[PDB]
Design a protein around this ligand. Structure first.
Ligand SMILES: [Zn+2]
Length: 57
């Protein structure tokens, strides 16, 4: 165990905001894109993130 409070930053660009520790301690089971109506399994979170990103880029 690392002991003491020590959270690793996911992104530097996002650091400039309220990431909320509660969000880090939560692993979704499924995802649903409200922009394309596509579902992404918890394991596809990475693919989902890229998918949702494409809609923001
Ligand atoms: Zn989509």
């Amino acid at each position: 165990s690392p002991l003491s409070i020590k959270k690793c930053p996911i992104c530097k660009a996002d650091d400039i905001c309220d990431h909320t520790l509660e969000q880090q301690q939560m692993q979704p089971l499924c995802f649903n894109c409200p922009i394309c109506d596509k579902i992404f399994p918890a394991t596809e979170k990475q693919i989902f993130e890229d998918h949702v990103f494409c809609h923001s880029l």
